[PDB]
Amino acid sequence: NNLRLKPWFHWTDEERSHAIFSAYEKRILKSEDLPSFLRANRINNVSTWVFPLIALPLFNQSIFKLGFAQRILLTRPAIEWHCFKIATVAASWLAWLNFSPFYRKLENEKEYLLDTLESRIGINVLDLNDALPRWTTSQEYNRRTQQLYNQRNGFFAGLLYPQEESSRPLVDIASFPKNLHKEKLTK
Amino acid sequence: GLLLGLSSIYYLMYVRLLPFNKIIFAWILVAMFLYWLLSGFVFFVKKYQYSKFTAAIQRFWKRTYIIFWVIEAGTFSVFFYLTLNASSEPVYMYDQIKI
Amino acid sequence: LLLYILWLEFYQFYHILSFYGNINWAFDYDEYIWTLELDTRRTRLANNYI
Amino acid sequence: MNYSYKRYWEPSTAEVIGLSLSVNTISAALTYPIEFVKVRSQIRTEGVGIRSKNLYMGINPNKVFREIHATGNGLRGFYQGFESHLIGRLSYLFIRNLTYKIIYDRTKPVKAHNDLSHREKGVIAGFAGGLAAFLTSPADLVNTRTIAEGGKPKEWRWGYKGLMDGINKIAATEGGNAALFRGSYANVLRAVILNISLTGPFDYLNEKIWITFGDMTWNKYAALLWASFWGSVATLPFDNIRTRLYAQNADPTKNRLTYSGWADAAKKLIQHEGISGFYVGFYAFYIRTFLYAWTTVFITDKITSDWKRKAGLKEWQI
Amino acid sequence: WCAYFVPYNIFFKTHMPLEHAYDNLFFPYFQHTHFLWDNNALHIPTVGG
Amino acid sequence: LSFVYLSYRLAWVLFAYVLIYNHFLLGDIGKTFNVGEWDHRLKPSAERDYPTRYESLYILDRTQKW
Amino acid sequence: MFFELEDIKRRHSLYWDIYNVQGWVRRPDSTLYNNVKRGVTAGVVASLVQ
Amino acid sequence: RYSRNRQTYRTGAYWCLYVNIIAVVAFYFWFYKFTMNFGYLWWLLYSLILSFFFSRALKHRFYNPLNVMTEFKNGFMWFIIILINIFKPLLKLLENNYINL
Amino acid sequence: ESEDLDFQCESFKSQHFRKKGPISQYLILGLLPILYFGTEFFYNHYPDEDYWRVAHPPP
Amino acid sequence: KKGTASEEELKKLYDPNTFYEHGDNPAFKQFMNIAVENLREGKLTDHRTYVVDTYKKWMYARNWDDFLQRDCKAITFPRAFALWIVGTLGMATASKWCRQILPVGSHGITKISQTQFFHQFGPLGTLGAVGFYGLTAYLYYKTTIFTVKKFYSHCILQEREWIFEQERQNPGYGEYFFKDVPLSAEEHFNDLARGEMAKKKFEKPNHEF
Amino acid sequence: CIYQAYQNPLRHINTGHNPNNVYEDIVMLGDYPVQ
Amino acid sequence: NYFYYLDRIKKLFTYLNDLRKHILKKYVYTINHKRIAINYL
Amino acid sequence: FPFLEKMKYNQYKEYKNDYLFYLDFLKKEITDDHSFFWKARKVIKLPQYSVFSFVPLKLMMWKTMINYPESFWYAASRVVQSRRKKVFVTKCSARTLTTAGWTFITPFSSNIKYT
Numbered sequence A: 001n002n003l004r005l006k007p008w009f010h011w012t013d014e015e016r017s018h019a020i021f022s023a024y025e026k027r028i029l030k031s032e033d034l035p036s037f038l039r040a041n042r043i044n045n046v047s048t049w050v051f052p053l054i055a056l057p058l059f060n061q062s063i064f065k066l067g068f069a070q071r072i073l074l075t076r077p078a079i080e081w082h083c084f085k086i087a088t089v090a091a092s093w094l095a096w097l098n099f100s101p102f103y104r105k106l107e108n109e110k111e112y113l114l115d116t117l118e119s120r121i122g123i124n125v126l127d128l129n130d131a132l133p134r135w136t137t138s139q140e141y142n143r144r145t146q147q148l149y150n151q152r153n154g155f156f157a158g159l160l161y162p163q164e165e166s167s168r169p170l171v172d173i174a175s176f177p178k179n180l181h182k183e184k185l186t187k
Numbered sequence B: 001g002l003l004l005g006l007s008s009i010y011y012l013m014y015v016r017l018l019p020f021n022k023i024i025f026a027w028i029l030v031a032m033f034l035y036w037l038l039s040g041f042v043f044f045v046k047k048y049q050y051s052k053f054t055a056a057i058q059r060f061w062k063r064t065y066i067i068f069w070v071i072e073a074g075t076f077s078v079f080f081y082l083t084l085n086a087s088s089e090p091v092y093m094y095d096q097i098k099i
Numbered sequence C: 001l002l003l004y005i006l007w008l009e010f011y012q013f014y015h016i017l018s019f020y021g022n023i024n025w026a027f028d029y030d031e032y033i034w035t036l037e038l039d040t041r042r043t044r045l046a047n048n049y050i
Numbered sequence D: 001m002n003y004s005y006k007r008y009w010e011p012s013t014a015e016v017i018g019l020s021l022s023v024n025t026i027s028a029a030l031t032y033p034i035e036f037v038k039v040r041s042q043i044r045t046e047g048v049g050i051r052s053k054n055l056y057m058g059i060n061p062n063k064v065f066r067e068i069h070a071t072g073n074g075l076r077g078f079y080q081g082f083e084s085h086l087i088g089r090l091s092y093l094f095i096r097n098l099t100y101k102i103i104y105d106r107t108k109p110v111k112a113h114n115d116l117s118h119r120e121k122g123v124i125a126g127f128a129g130g131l132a133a134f135l136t137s138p139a140d141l142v143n144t145r146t147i148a149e150g151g152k153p154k155e156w157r158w159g160y161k162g163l164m165d166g167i168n169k170i171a172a173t174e175g176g177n178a179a180l181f182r183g184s185y186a187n188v189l190r191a192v193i194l195n196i197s198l199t200g201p202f203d204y205l206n207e208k209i210w211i212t213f214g215d216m217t218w219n220k221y222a223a224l225l226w227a228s229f230w231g232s233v234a235t236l237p238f239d240n241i242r243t244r245l246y247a248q249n250a251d252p253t254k255n256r257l258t259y260s261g262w263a264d265a266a267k268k269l270i271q272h273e274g275i276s277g278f279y280v281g282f283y284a285f286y287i288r289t290f291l292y293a294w295t296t297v298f299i300t301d302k303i304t305s306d307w308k309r310k311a312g313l314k315e316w317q318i
Numbered sequence E: 001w002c003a004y005f006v007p008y009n010i011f012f013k014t015h016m017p018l019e020h021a022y023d024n025l026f027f028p029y030f031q032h033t034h035f036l037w038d039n040n041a042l043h044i045p046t047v048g049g
Numbered sequence F: 001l002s003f004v005y006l007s008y009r010l011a012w013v014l015f016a017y018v019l020i021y022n023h024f025l026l027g028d029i030g031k032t033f034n035v036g037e038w039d040h041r042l043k044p045s046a047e048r049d050y051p052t053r054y055e056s057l058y059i060l061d062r063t064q065k066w
Numbered sequence G: 001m002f003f004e005l006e007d008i009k010r011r012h013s014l015y016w017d018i019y020n021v022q023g024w025v026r027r028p029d030s031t032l033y034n035n036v037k038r039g040v041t042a043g044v045v046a047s048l049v050q
Numbered sequence H: 001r002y003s004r005n006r007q008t009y010r011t012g013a014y015w016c017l018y019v020n021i022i023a024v025v026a027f028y029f030w031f032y033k034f035t036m037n038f039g040y041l042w043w044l045l046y047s048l049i050l051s052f053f054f055s056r057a058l059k060h061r062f063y064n065p066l067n068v069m070t071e072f073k074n075g076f077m078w079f080i081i082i083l084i085n086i087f088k089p090l091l092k093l094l095e096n097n098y099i100n101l
Numbered sequence I: 001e002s003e004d005l006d007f008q009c010e011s012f013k014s015q016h017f018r019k020k021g022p023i024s025q026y027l028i029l030g031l032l033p034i035l036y037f038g039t040e041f042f043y044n045h046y047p048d049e050d051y052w053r054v055a056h057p058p059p
Numbered sequence J: 001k002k003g004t005a006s007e008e009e010l011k012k013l014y015d016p017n018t019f020y021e022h023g024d025n026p027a028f029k030q031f032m033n034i035a036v037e038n039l040r041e042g043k044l045t046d047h048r049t050y051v052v053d054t055y056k057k058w059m060y061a062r063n064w065d066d067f068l069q070r071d072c073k074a075i076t077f078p079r080a081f082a083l084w085i086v087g088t089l090g091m092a093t094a095s096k097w098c099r100q101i102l103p104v105g106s107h108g109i110t111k112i113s114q115t116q117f118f119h120q121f122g123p124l125g126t127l128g129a130v131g132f133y134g135l136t137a138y139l140y141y142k143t144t145i146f147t148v149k150k151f152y153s154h155c156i157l158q159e160r161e162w163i164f165e166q167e168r169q170n171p172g173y174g175e176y177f178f179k180d181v182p183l184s185a186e187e188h189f190n191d192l193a194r195g196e197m198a199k200k201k202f203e204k205p206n207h208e209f
Numbered sequence K: 001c002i003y004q005a006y007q008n009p010l011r012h013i014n015t016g017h018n019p020n021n022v023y024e025d026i027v028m029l030g031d032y033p034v035q
Numbered sequence L: 001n002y003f004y005y006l007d008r009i010k011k012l013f014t015y016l017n018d019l020r021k022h023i024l025k026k027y028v029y030t031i032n033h034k035r036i037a038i039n040y041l
Numbered sequence M: 001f002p003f004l005e006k007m008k009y010n011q012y013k014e015y016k017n018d019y020l021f022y023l024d025f026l027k028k029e030i031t032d033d034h035s036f037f038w039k040a041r042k043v044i045k046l047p048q049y050s051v052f053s054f055v056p057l058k059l060m061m062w063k064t065m066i067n068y069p070e071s072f073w074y075a076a077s078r079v080v081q082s083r084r085k086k087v088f089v090t091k092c093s094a095r096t097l098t099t100a101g102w103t104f105i106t107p108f109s110s111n112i113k114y115t
């Protein structure tokens, strides 16, 4: 299925994370499929927040000792030297954010989870997406998924938070009453 | 005032979930219309406080006021005549309770 | 006082304009369900003119 | 429109070369006097520019023609340098057509009803025209100098009496063969602009008028008018700069306004005359280009239709 | 209390008009509805301003 | 001045759009104009009630209110 | 291909209208030979008398 | 008798332009449901977008690439200077922590 | 703008006289009916794309 | 070796040149392979998302890239570059205004406290100016990366919005309905292609949950 | 107001009324006359 | 000077901007009855 | 029009607010969820295939539709060569899309049933 377009081929990282969280909270996805995704998300966050700290000493040892770096350091104000260092560090950090192997692994794990959801609920996986609120990011959705996992697997899974097992009544949708009418408004 | 106005506007938008782009375009047009309608009057008020408000200007403004009210009264009177002469079904068999 | 009169005028105007939307509840016995229905209005033309 | 072409028959390289050479020969023979008048008007307006107002803004091609004819040389005076002009035009056409046909054959689409986009066709045509103009620049230089001799003062004239004589004089007197490529860059730019600003508007208007009025016969000629007008509008400044560079005499004292290059000539033109100065003799240039294109298209279409009918193509394919 | 609380409850929290709304009118009795009038939402700027 | 300039630029551009579209671009109404609307929330959501430029990416619906 | 300007030939599809008349249809008699002959005859006859 | 009157009404001209725009757009949307596709003639929309910045750019002569480049360099230096000044006193706080101890 | 008093000077030379200018736009003015009708019918293809086309019977 | 008439027709359908056109999407070179996978059972998948409006989002633009691609209608490299020029001018103006309001690094000033703006407003004003500059810089970076991506996709890879290209090719009432090209019209589309496209079927869900 | 300064900024409060490239406000951004 | 042509172009730009302002003032923002009547015609 | 149709997804609206039976709803059988199927427009007799695709050619590929910010009207806009040049052939489906002249004669002018 290399040439087959998956249902979420156009979804962003935020949309994919929101879909995963929605499936988990609605219990379409069980808690036994999360741990790999959670570990990948934590590793990605650690790498993203630690990259500049490891990179700047490397730039000091290798790049900032280059000919052009020494020229800038010795021939321009210290403020301009600091600006150049900050600019190069920021560019490297952006490149890392874009092409991190850890980020790629996290995206691959999200793809695997989405494939599992597609197999489980057919094409209805598209129903898990909505108009995500602005400024809510994939990291935030992953944090929410981790929080829900902790709440469900913690000591307060039935005292302070809802349990993971579903106790929905067993009825027939084709005959059970519905809360909404197709066209009119009910009383 | 800003708190109350913004809260009321947002609540009234939310209760009916209006289309944002179309409604904001319409409200921008309305805002420009009202702002430029009132800007002329603000300019007149600011300009006539010194060396501009003469007897001719005062008479002109009185005449404009009375003319505007007369123009509105014309349409109101046309509608009042229509109300007074409002048509109805024949009184014999179609509508006997009109009496 | 002008704000009070404005509120009264707006309330009356809203009632008058909402008259023309005739909304009623109809009870479907087969489904045992009340449904909201909208319909036009018929009245004396003097009321519309006023 | 990407599949509206009908390239069901394509001429061979020899046929293309021969037909193009003959048709361009007769077209140049017919339309040479207009180019002569345009060049003379540009030379006489160089350094001064248009100074009339409103309807009189410009130089009258009829006035220039009458002044040239009054010299007593008759119509033979308008064909001075025609040998050089024809040789240069033939060399340019040969090189450009060969390069364009080779590239088009190499990169043509497989389907007969599909043709290269106008962008790619313009790129290829511009490259071929620039190469040909660079190769055959000296002939144009000699022809333009011969034309401008009459306008310029006798002491400033070069006195060439043939293409070979002019080439030899330029090579010897000015020193080195490098002097034969004066104005080559301007000629290349003019050729590129002319190649790219002709085939686009023609197809544009031809298709639009076909859509409007359906399949008629005047559509081709209306599109030709539109394309010729827009090509003149796009190309005339470069032709004027090329003419100025060619007319620039070797000795700085001889030149009324010496130039060091294309940019220098453009700056001097802008300084000494408004931006409109690039469009002196626009009517003559438009008439020349339109007549040349019309005769070439007519003859080529007739011959190609005859060849297609002999081959056996259907009426709609032709 | 007068301009925001009471109008809000009388307009949105009930479809039943008050007496003074229609005592002078001659229409038959009917209820209100906030979601079947002024589709252009021209009342939002008015109330806000 | 910011408000004044915004208003003037918007007015000029919209007026130019109106004139050009009503005088030259009436041949292909489908290509020149987009169809949209929004109805009262009491009635079911209209088919044309959607965010323009995103109809290929989202479908909008709402719950009726009394 | 033959020179700087290219006369691009394009094919089109069938189109027809309700009415096939009152437009432009070339008469069979409208030809170079026949039109020229008639014009020359008329012009010469008129010019001789004039 | 009448005092001097202004000889131009720019706000009035623009108010009339807005009135025309409102009339046309509102009527088409309400009764035809048609909204002009501004993207068809994308260059007028881009003209509006450009005019939203063109005068301010012209004031400082930002049509010159050299001016733009030097302005970007100066702005980046200003931003970095502000950040460094804000975050510098952390070192002094750490140093005086020793005195406090 | 904010440097000149709003007044009319005594000198009559301040009168705004009309002086004829470029004449090119008047060519388009004279050709306007042709241009306007062409835009109305040919450019907008009104009432349809076949009315103005040369008539051909169906195959 | 060559098969029967049916096999020859299938080979022609799978031929790269049977559907591809010079001015059309290159994907038509393997459209049949793509169609067989994306049109299983003859059904077109609806990739749209069903959204119940709740005012959680207004502009509906997921990100600045989507805003430029859809709201600004910049679907071509020239439009992207024009928007980039506008953004560059805006960023330069924003930086100049920030430097003017806070004369830090100019006139020899080396401290924020040496500014009348800080005197009048102080740390909150400095924070506001910093936030404004950062916001404009962020938007400039987003539009620049969008323009670079558009340039790479179009100028280098020759990728284009093929629906827009078809719109350009057909200016309206054009008679380009040719039987030779199946894609020109619905009628001219090959009958066997319709059957071949719906050859495969979907897979039933597991319902494992 | 392009390459030619006609109005006097010393007698104006804001120079942004008309497009130009040769005018600068006397009271620039960040300047606050305070007693 | 090395930018005489550039100076001429700057003069042209100034002339065009001044003409734009003059046209806007005299035919768009004007309240003159004769000009309004001509535009009406 | 089917893209504009909203009743197709009306079933999901109830579960967007009532999650209690959302899993049971998902456990149903998928027939036409998030899919469009156009009935045959031409008579085809091919025993080899039991189903045929009649999706619009312009709507065939989503890879170009996803990033195109336009409505799905290009697919329906003048994509068929078939035409009927007859006067009796109606050009407007709605016979009430007319005008009552400049006199505004009622009830023709003032009733939507006619104008």
Ligand SMILES: CCCCCCCCCCCCCCCCCC(=O)OC[C@H](COP(=O)([O-])OCC(O)COP(=O)([O-])OC[C@@H](COC(=O)CCCCCCCCCCCCCCCCC)OC(=O)CCCCCCCCCCCCCCCCC)OC(=O)CCCCCCCCCCCCCCCCC
Pocket: D130, D131, D134, D181, D182, D183, D184, D185, D186, D188, D260, D261, D262, D263, D264, D266, D267
């Ligand atoms: C303010 C402006 C704003 C924008 C608007 C612009 C308006 C412009 C006009 C008004 C203003 C004034 C001008 C300003 C120009 C500014 C730019 C500039 O620098 O251009 C100068 C530039 C050059 O002008 P120049 O400096 O005067 O020099 C030209 C001279 O004429 C050269 O002299 P020549 O003609 O006598 O040439 C002799 C010839 C002598 O010949 C030689 O080259 C000698 C050495 C090689 C010899 C061998 C040749 C090959 C044969 C042998 C091969 C090997 C053997 C093979 C086997 C054996 C058989 C052969 O030399 C050449 O070939 C050319 C010179 C370079 C030679 C050195 C080597 C080059 C190598 C690379 C090229 C190689 C290929 C060349 C040929 C083409 C391909 C076929 O001209 C232009 O760029 C033209 C104008 C601009 C065009 C682009 C459009 C820009 C505007 C776009 C629209 C904008 C609208 C919106 C507004 C934007 C506002 C910003």
Ligand SMILES: CCCCCCCCCCCCCCCCCC(=O)OC[C@H](COP(=O)([O-])OCC(O)COP(=O)([O-])OC[C@@H](COC(=O)CCCCCCCCCCCCCCCCC)OC(=O)CCCCCCCCCCCCCCCCC)OC(=O)CCCCCCCCCCCCCCCCC
Pocket: A048, A086, A087, A089, A090, A093, A135, A137, A138, A139, A140, H083, H087, J127, J128, J130, J131, J132, J134, J135, J138
């Ligand atoms: C020892 C044990 C320690 C244990 C640990 C705990 C204890 C230790 C201390 C813990 C401290 C925790 C601190 C938490 C806050 C900070 C971190 C945080 O939350 O980050 C936000 C953010 C949260 O995102 P996320 O949830 O992780 O999602 C990431 C996902 O991968 C995908 O997400 P995405 O990337 O798509 O989304 C990006 C962004 C979406 O983009 C945006 O929305 C950003 C829009 C532009 C904002 C511009 C703000 C101005 C400052 C910019 C940054 C500094 C200047 C950079 C200059 C660069 C050029 C040199 O999303 C957001 O973050 C949305 C936030 C929106 C709220 C903004 C708040 C207001 C800002 C304005 C304030 C001033 C005005 C208002 C004042 C009001 C006062 C009442 O973190 C990041 O992901 C950022 C990653 C790194 C990017 C670096 C980019 C280049 C700049 C850095 C290099 C140059 C530095 C130069 C200065 C150096 C000296 C200072």
Ligand SMILES: CCCCCCCCCCCCCCCCCC(=O)OC[C@H](COP(=O)([O-])OCC[N+](C)(C)C)OC(=O)CCCCCCCCCCCCCCCCC
Pocket: C001, C003, C004, C005, C007, C008, C011, E002, E003, E006, E007, E010, E020
């Ligand atoms: C209690 C003692 C501590 C100090 C108290 C301080 C007094 C506070 C007074 C608040 C006045 C609020 C004015 C609101 C105006 C808008 C009203 C409106 O829109 O109507 C909504 C509502 C009415 O909504 P409604 O639609 O239900 O109207 C009911 C209509 N009738 C009466 C026929 C049944 O307003 C009211 O309920 C009353 C409004 C009265 C407005 C009177 C205006 C002039 C006088 C103002 C009070 C002056 C008091 C001065 C201090 C005296 C101290 C002794």
Ligand SMILES: CCCCCCCCCCCCCCCCCC(=O)OC[C@H](COP(=O)([O-])OCC[N+](C)(C)C)OC(=O)CCCCCCCCCCCCCCCCC
Pocket: D029, D030, D072, D073, D074, D075, D076, D077, D079
């Ligand atoms: C073997 C015996 C059997 C008969 C053999 C044939 C007899 C000899 C025929 C000689 C050639 C005759 C035609 C010459 C050209 C036209 C007449 C003439 O004098 O022109 C010379 C004119 C010159 O005229 P001129 O004006 O310079 O004459 C001298 C002028 N004064 C007295 C002031 C000095 O042209 C040239 O000689 C130069 C250009 C020639 C090449 C370009 C020709 C372009 C036009 C070609 C198309 C047809 C033109 C004719 C159209 C009208 C007739 C159909």
Ligand SMILES: CCCCCCCCCCCCCCCCCC(=O)OC[C@H](COP(=O)([O-])OCC[N+](C)(C)C)OC(=O)CCCCCCCCCCCCCCCCC
Pocket: D001, D116, D117, D118, D119, D120, D121, D122, D123, D126, D127, D130, D192, D196, D200, J168, J169, J170
């Ligand atoms: C600030 C100033 C900066 C100046 C320098 C940097 C910027 C340079 C910008 C250059 C722009 C070039 C644009 C080319 C013209 C495209 C116009 C266009 O799209 O028109 C629509 C049409 C598009 O046609 P189409 O193929 O899409 O189809 C048209 C038909 N319909 C509408 C139905 C689809 O393109 C043309 O007609 C272009 C024809 C000309 C193409 C060739 C251009 C010149 C190429 C030169 C190559 C090199 C020559 C040798 C050089 C030797 C020395 C190095």
Ligand SMILES: CCCCCCCCCCCCCCCCCC(=O)OC[C@H](COP(=O)([O-])OCC[N+](C)(C)C)OC(=O)CCCCCCCCCCCCCCCCC
Pocket: D049, D050, D051, D052, D273, D274, D275, D276, D277, H063, K002, L013, L016
């Ligand atoms: C149907 C609609 C679509 C139409 C498409 C078809 C083409 C449309 C073409 C429209 C443009 C027409 C231009 C006409 C040109 C003039 C013709 C004429 O005869 O007039 C000559 C006159 C004078 O030309 P002249 O200067 O050469 O005069 C010569 C003077 N003597 C004789 C003394 C030597 O031209 C002008 O006065 C100027 C004309 C151009 C005006 C340009 C206006 C826009 C400028 C924008 C600049 C933006 C700069 C931004 C960068 C930053 C700046 C600080």
Ligand SMILES: CCCCCCCCCCCCCCCCCC(=O)OC[C@H](COP(=O)([O-])OCC[N+](C)(C)C)OC(=O)CCCCCCCCCCCCCCCCC
Pocket: D050, D055, D056, D057, D058, D059, D060, D061, D230, D233, D234, D275, D276, D279, D280, D281, D282, D283, D284
């Ligand atoms: C507007 C946005 C663009 C950027 C900002 C503006 C900068 C550019 C401003 C240019 C203004 C116009 C300059 C030329 C003025 C010519 C005036 C004139 O007619 O002079 C009398 C000349 C006189 O020519 P004549 O010598 O043949 O005279 C014939 C008339 N009698 C016989 C009476 C003397 O008339 C013409 O040539 C008429 C046609 C003029 C066409 C001018 C086209 C200018 C195009 C320049 C750019 C190149 C084309 C690009 C677009 C098309 C191709 C893609």
Ligand SMILES: CCCCCCCCCCCCCCCCCC(=O)OC[C@H](COP(=O)([O-])OCC[N+](C)(C)C)OC(=O)CCCCCCCCCCCCCCCCC
Pocket: B008, B072, C003, C006, C007, C010, C017, C018, C020, C021, E003, E004, E007, E036, E037, E038, E039, E042, E043, E046, E047, E048
């Ligand atoms: C305009 C003034 C100056 C000029 C004077 C002359 C103008 C004369 C205009 C009328 C001429 C005659 C024609 C009459 C047409 C009537 C049309 C009509 O009824 O439309 C009404 C329309 C309703 O039309 P509709 O079409 O929606 O009607 C619904 C009916 N059905 C369902 C059948 C379609 O309403 C509006 O236009 C909205 C008005 C909103 C007013 C909001 C007032 C707010 C007051 C706030 C203060 C009070 C206290 C609360 C404060 C709270 C603060 C938080």
Ligand SMILES: CCCCCCCCCCCCCCCCCC(=O)OC[C@H](COP(=O)([O-])OCC[N+](C)(C)C)OC(=O)CCCCCCCCCCCCCCCCC
Pocket: D207, D208, D209, D211, D212, D222, D223, D225, D226, D229, F024, F025, F027, I028, I031, I034, I035, I038, I039, I042, I043, I044, I045, J171, J172
């Ligand atoms: C009298 C003609 C000259 C007028 C000069 C002054 C006005 C400016 C020019 C206006 C346009 C002139 C007509 C030709 C171009 C029409 C382009 C167009 O949009 O038509 C498409 C239209 C239909 O195009 P379409 O229907 O395919 O699509 C148009 C665009 N959309 C998709 C938005 C609808 O075609 C026509 O109306 C047919 C026009 C036939 C004209 C034949 C005579 C003129 C041809 C020779 C001209 C030679 C000189 C050069 C032109 C004048 C000087 C610059």
Ligand SMILES: CCCCCCCCCCCCCCCCCC(=O)OC[C@H](COP(=O)([O-])OCC[N+](C)(C)C)OC(=O)CCCCCCCCCCCCCCCCC
Pocket: A014, A134, A135, A136, A137, A138, B023, B024, B025, B027, B028, J059, J061, J062, J063, J064, J065, J067, J142
């Ligand atoms: C009648 C009213 C008329 C109103 C007209 C205005 C309508 C709205 C126009 C919006 C245009 C801007 C782009 C819209 C599309 C956004 C797309 C997007 O994702 O965002 C792009 C960008 C963000 O880039 P992004 O695209 O990377 O962000 C999305 C990506 N994730 C999910 C990872 C975050 O945001 C913006 O364009 C807007 C940023 C904020 C602008 C603020 C301006 C004013 C300054 C602050 C004032 C003080 C506020 C105080 C708040 C206090 C809170 C407690």
